[PDB]
RNA sequence: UUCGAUGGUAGGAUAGAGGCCUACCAUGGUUUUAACGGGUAACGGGGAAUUAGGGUUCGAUUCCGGAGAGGGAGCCUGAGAAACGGCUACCACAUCCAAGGAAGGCAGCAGGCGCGCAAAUUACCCAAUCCCGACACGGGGAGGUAGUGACAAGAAAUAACAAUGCAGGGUCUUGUAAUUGGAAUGAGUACAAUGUAAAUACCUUAACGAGGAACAAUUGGAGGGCAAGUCUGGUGCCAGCAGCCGCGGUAAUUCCAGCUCCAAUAGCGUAUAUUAAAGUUGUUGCAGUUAAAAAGCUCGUAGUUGAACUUUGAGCCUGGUCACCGGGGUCGUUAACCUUCUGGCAAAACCAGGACUUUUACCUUGAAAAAAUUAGAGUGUUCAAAGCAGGCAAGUUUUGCUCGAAUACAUUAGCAUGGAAUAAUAAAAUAGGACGUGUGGUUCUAUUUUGUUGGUUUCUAGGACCGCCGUAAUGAUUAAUAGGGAUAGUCGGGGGCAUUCGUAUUCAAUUGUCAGAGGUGAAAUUCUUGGAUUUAUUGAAGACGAACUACUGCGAAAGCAUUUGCCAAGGAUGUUUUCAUUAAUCAAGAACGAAAGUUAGGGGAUCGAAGACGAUCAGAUACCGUCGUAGUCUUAACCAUAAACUAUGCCGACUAGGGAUCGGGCAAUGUUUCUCGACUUGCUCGGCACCUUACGAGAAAUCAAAGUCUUUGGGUUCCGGGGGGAGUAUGGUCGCAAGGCUGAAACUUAAAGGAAUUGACGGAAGGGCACCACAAUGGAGUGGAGCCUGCGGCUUAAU
RNA sequence: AAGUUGGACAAACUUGGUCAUUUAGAGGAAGUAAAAGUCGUAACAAGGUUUCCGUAGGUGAACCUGCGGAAGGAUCAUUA
RNA sequence: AAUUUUCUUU
């Protein structure tokens, strides 16, 4: 049940039953933690952190060896972005759609998609303000959205 | 989206019983589902059930033996006092001797008859006969 | 379908309140039309004065003369149509006889083949029908 | 919110709080959880009617509270009145006037007028209940009693014992009695006792008081509904009957007269309001593909609903109505009344009592709670509606005893006790944390004493704030075949911009012979030896992307079909990636929204509303042919609906067998073509659909949903309450307009409608039959002529 | 006491705006019901131009036509 | 091509 679509896909990742560090691995916990910190300074999103670590370095799930989620590790070590990754990606997509619309005003489909993205951004922002991830006076303005992204 | 898991469990069980199958797989599982099933088990309508403990809500495989006609849920959870138990029994049960109404009494999930014995009302969960 | 939440009493009550106006019976009670525009303000009977006699024609498949009269109410000023039940009473009933008008028994609807008539006469000259018919009482010399 | 609407200060006024009022200072208070305004033929409640339950309606009225005394306003007296059987002024009425004036209020008890369908005596009494006063002694139209009725409930006059023959029945019993006769007769008549303030009445009193008009039972119906006539006479679609269907045109079981029968009974019918049936208001418990009904589609806030997970189980003691059940304490799993105050024990710690929900919703019990009324316990008003009394006690008459006048229903709402299952929020993140006879400090108070108030330092006891000390296991639920986001290869006739190509249509120029060309069923209009049409070359304009093209793809829908490039975005798939409940459905509010229609600019090839002619027809105004304006294309502004359809809302779970198709992924010591592609097979996810079947559903047609529904409850929006009137009128709102949205009432009607079946019909199809059908150059003919004869019309007397 | 000056409550009257209800009117445009009228035949069969919906135009009228949709069609079908 | 109409009942 897609929130803004009629699709009913169920594609996802099925984590293993064994919630333990890998039997054949030498991650050494702290080495991976500093490795994540190095990649965070390099400037890649936590999704890219897990993808690169799983595909190349060979750690299936980082929390299995580290004991905490990578976002928790980044927050604990201080490299915590002010805007959450999902909200940042949504606002960046909205900015790209708005730029496309302002250069090409006849794209009614893009206008409809911008409305959907705007609604999704507002719902996500309301959730984050309620939980406390963002200041209660966060708000979202299209004029300053470009400065918010950059 | 999913609203109540007991309703889905009872709908699947009654569908399997009507089809005539001797087993049914229920997902998701919960404490309310477990308490409902043990009440049905101590009353003899449902045989052994194995709770598959996953690192999730968890699944359960139930062995049936027929002898039940329909198990259903009562949504919303109406508040049932001691005096309203008879009215609910007349409204839902086939007769005064056959049929069980499950109430989430403050003492715990229990049948309407033993809820009367304990002299405590609650909220109506469902029924089976 | 219908709301079934434990806290949807207001929604259910409001929807029932809106939908109950579609009921013909509820509308006819709550509109006050009996006291607003109906010839009878809830009264069972009303006195009136005979205006004229009209020979209405029966509808299909019947064919006869209904022997009706027109009566002007004294308390409302509304001119209505009246039906004489028996036969040979239109000769007895003359103009200005102080007739009494009542319903027909169809809750204000036309009964039978009579077109556009909803009332019937019960008393003439303050003596009552079926009394002068059997020559038990006589019309006063008015 | 002016002229008090929300709050603060101060004052005034009030018996008293208070914007009740005044001065100043602030702009506040309510509201889609419906504020405010309007209507109410609305005094409110206890309560009444119907009664499976849930509900619906009523409640002026014997009890409680509020208002009024014709409508307002003011005021004295009095504790208590803004009193009206107290006063004053105005407004609308009535009255005596000598014309100067005077004077009132029955929505109190009686009585009168008027409105009326609609409702009583100008009566007696303070004897019972109580009230007032100076008070045994007085008064009370409060109140008790009676006169009047058709009705409000309860009991019951219009009968009945035998002889009698017939129909009988099986020697025992019912009926028609133009029959008798002695019986018990009560309604009344009178009188006596009792009753009562006086009575009336009830009870009670001897006694008079039926042989048939005894001292005449009625009201409706007799076709179905619904019970009881095809009986006799009068009319003949007329009178009429008739709740609906419906009967009546000379045989009328349904009209009016007679006979009899059926139902209730001193009562019955009719008119209206309401309730049950109405599962046609549907929370229980309706229906929405075709009968009325899913917004064209999407976003979105109130509102509603919201995955799972945090202490479960085993063994005892003791006492309770029946191998059983409810209730209190424990020990070990894992520490077992957390924490506080007080009292004790004392190396901190323990026991006892009180408080003990962070915070509710929920359930149980208790308290205080008006009676009547409802249910209901007891009880000889002769039973009963009743009433709350009453009983003992025949053998003494004893100046006595004995009992009851319960209980529940109530709980909406408030208060309190007990439980913590079901449904919620924070328990500490930058540790802002149980941290505590702990290492140090500061602020205040005297709950005590220094002699009594009062002033300071503070030992002392207490409240609070500042950096440190690991007391110890120091703190972040998995990540939902939920969701969002990211990532990789893809996929798409998804969107926009720029660009490329294709034939066809029309037109223009030029070249070749000549007679028709178009079109149609037939034609006809029109133009063609001035070269029509055709053929050939070149060019321009606009429109559109044939075949490929499919029970195939994409998009929220409307819709999207030539090549390439660019941009933004999207579904599915793969994933030991990321966040962690962020979710579903929506009022109000917004985006898109075919075609047609509008305003300005460009362009107008083809087709083509309006129109022009030309054929068909009785009339063609249309269907047919040619031409033809708006329009068909596009840009910038509009609107906003279609059979916008799958006539079928969205999300989630389950349910039977098979084979095709699209996109992705997995596997093949599979095939093939100079590392990949194509093809083949199996598995899986997500779509478009298909065949068979019916565990199941529906009224059926039919449906893998329209199933999991009388065995009725997963969540959430829209929408319908018989057919016309009518998507009309009015009102509001948007639009330049056309029109869009919302949207009645009066009146009328017994049907409208859906599915399916059998006939009939079809200028529908497919098989065939026929000189009462045709074909055959058919044969003979009739009708054309004159006459025989029959039928219409004419005439007469009948023709 | 008669009488006098101010203040507050304040009946009531004239006028203007607003709300609710009721009620005349010259005239105009509708629906509703008919024992046997005039005009023609739109729909129900391929109703004789298949029907219906939205929009626009026209005509004595049912109605006709242009554009886009639906089968509720008279086709569930041409795999070659 | 072309084919309009069948009063109210028994």
UniProtKB/Swiss-Prot annotation, chain A:
Any Gene Ontology CC annotation: cytosolic small ribosomal subunit
Gene3D superfamilies the record matches: 4.10.860.130, S15/NS1, RNA-binding
Origin species: Schizosaccharomyces pombe (strain 972 / ATCC 24843)
Taxon lineage: Eukaryota, Fungi, Dikarya, Ascomycota, Taphrinomycotina
Subunit comment: Component of the small ribosomal subunit (SSU). Mature yeast ribosomes consist of a small (40S) and a large (60S) subunit. The 40S small subunit contains 1 molecule of ribosomal RNA (18S rRNA) and at least 33 different proteins. The large 60S subunit contains 3 rRNA molecules (25S, 5.8S and 5S rRNA) and at least 46 different proteins.
UniProt-listed PANTHER family: RIBOSOMAL PROTEIN S15P/S13E, SMALL RIBOSOMAL SUBUNIT PROTEIN US15
Similarity-based family: Belongs to the universal ribosomal protein uS15 family.
Descriptive protein name: Small ribosomal subunit protein uS15
GO biological process entries: cytoplasmic translation
Curated annotation (Swiss-Prot), chain B:
Family to which the UniProt record says this protein belongs: Belongs to the universal ribosomal protein uS8 family.
SUPFAM superfamilies: Ribosomal protein S8
Subcellular location: Cytoplasm; Nucleus
Key words, A-Z: Cytoplasm, Nucleus, Ribonucleoprotein, Ribosomal protein
Main location: cytoplasm
GO cellular component assignments: cytoplasmic stress granule; cytosol; cytosolic small ribosomal subunit; nucleus
Protein name stated in the entry: Small ribosomal subunit protein uS8A
Record keyword Transmembrane helix present: no
GO biological process, one term: cytoplasmic translation
Main function: Component of the ribosome, a large ribonucleoprotein complex responsible for the synthesis of proteins in the cell. The small ribosomal subunit (SSU) binds messenger RNAs (mRNAs) and translates the encoded message by selecting cognate aminoacyl-transfer RNA (tRNA) molecules. The large subunit (LSU) contains the ribosomal catalytic site termed the peptidyl transferase center (PTC), which catalyzes the formation of peptide bonds, thereby polymerizing the amino acids delivered by tRNAs into a polypeptide chain.
Molecular function via GO: structural constituent of ribosome
Cytoplasm as UniProt keyword: yes
Signal peptide (from-to): none
Oligomeric and partner information: Component of the small ribosomal subunit (SSU). Mature yeast ribosomes consist of a small (40S) and a large (60S) subunit. The 40S small subunit contains 1 molecule of ribosomal RNA (18S rRNA) and at least 33 different proteins. The large 60S subunit contains 3 rRNA molecules (25S, 5.8S and 5S rRNA) and at least 46 different proteins.
Misc note: There are 2 genes for uS8 in S.pombe.
UniProtKB/Swiss-Prot annotation, chain C:
Other comment: There are 2 genes for uS12 in S.pombe.
Processing and modification events after translation: Hydroxylation at Pro-61 affects translation termination efficiency.
Domain of life: Eukaryota
GO biological process: cytoplasmic translation; translation
Chain positions found as 3,4-dihydroxyproline: 61
Chief subcellular location: cytoplasm
A GO MF label: structural constituent of ribosome
SUPFAM superfamilies: Nucleic acid-binding proteins
This protein's name: Small ribosomal subunit protein uS12A
Cellular-component GO terms for this entry: cytosolic small ribosomal subunit; nucleolus; nucleus; ribosome
Family statement drawn from the similarity comment of this UniProt entry: Belongs to the universal ribosomal protein uS12 family.
Pfam family, one: Ribosom_S12_S23
Subunit (UniProt): Component of the small ribosomal subunit (SSU). Mature yeast ribosomes consist of a small (40S) and a large (60S) subunit. The 40S small subunit contains 1 molecule of ribosomal RNA (18S rRNA) and at least 33 different proteins. The large 60S subunit contains 3 rRNA molecules (25S, 5.8S and 5S rRNA) and at least 46 different proteins.
Gene3D superfamilies, sorted: Nucleic acid-binding proteins
Primary role: Component of the ribosome, a large ribonucleoprotein complex responsible for the synthesis of proteins in the cell. The small ribosomal subunit (SSU) binds messenger RNAs (mRNAs) and translates the encoded message by selecting cognate aminoacyl-transfer RNA (tRNA) molecules. The large subunit (LSU) contains the ribosomal catalytic site termed the peptidyl transferase center (PTC), which catalyzes the formation of peptide bonds, thereby polymerizing the amino acids delivered by tRNAs into a polypeptide chain.
Cellular compartments annotated: Cytoplasm; Nucleus; Nucleus, Nucleolus
Keywords: Cytoplasm, Hydroxylation, Nucleus, Ribonucleoprotein, Ribosomal protein
PROSITE patterns: RIBOSOMAL_S12 (PS00055)
């Amino acid at each position: 049940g897609r929130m803004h679509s009629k699709g009913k896909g169920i594609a996802s990742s099925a984590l293993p039953y064994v919630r333990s560090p890998p039997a054949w691995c030498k991650a050494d916990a702290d080495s991976v933690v500093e490795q994540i910190l190095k990649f965070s300074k390099k400037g890649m999103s936590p999704s890219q952190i897990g993808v690169t670590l799983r595909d190349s370095h060979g750690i299936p799930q980082v929390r299995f060896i580290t004991g905490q989620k990578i976002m928790r590790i980044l927050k604990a070590n201080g490299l915590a972005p002010e805007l959450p990754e999902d909200l940042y990606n949504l606002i960046k997509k909205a900015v790209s759609v708005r730029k496309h619309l302002e250069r090409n005003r006849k794209d009614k489909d893009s206008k409809f998609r911008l409305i959907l993205i705007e609604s999704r951004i507002h719902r996500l922002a309301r959730y984050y303000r309620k939980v406390g991830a963002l200041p209660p006076t966060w708000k979202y303005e299209s004029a300053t959205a470009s400065a918010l992204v950059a | 989206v999913r609203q109540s898991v007991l309703a889905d469990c009872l709908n699947n069980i009654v569908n399997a019983e009507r089809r005539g199958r001797r087993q049914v797989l229920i997902r998701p599982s919960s404490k309310v589902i477990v308490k409902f099933l043990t009440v049905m088990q101590k009353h003899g309508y449902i045989d052994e059930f194995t709770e598959i403990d996953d690192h999730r809500s968890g699944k359960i495989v139930i062995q049936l033996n027929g002898r039940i006609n329909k198990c259903g849920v009562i949504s919303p959870r109406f508040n049932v006092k001691l005096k309203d138990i008879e009215k609910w029994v007349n409204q839902l049960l086939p007769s005064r001797q056959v049929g069980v109404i499950v109430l989430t009494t403050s003492r715990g999930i229990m049948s309407h008859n033993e809820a009367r014995a304990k002299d405590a009302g609650g909220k109506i969960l469902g029924f089976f006969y | 379908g219908k709301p079934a939440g434990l806290n949807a009493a207001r929604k259910l009550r409001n929807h029932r309140r809106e939908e109950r106006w579609a009921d013909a019976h509820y509308k006819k009670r709550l509109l006050g039309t009996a006291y607003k525009s109906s010839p009878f303000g809830g009264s069972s009977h009303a006195k009136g004065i005979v205006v004229e006699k009209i020979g209405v024609e029966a509808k299909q498949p019947n064919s006869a003369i209904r022997k009706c009269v027109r009566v002007q109410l004294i308390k409302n000023g509304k001119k209505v149509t009246a039906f004489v039940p028996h036969d040979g009473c239109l000769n007895f009933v003359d103009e200005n006889d102080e007739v009494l008008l009542s319903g027909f028994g169809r809750k204000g609807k036309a009964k039978g083949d009579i077109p556009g008539v909803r009332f019937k006469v019960v008393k003439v000259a303050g003596v009552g029908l079926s009394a002068l018919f059997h020559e038990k009482k006589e019309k006063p010399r008015a």
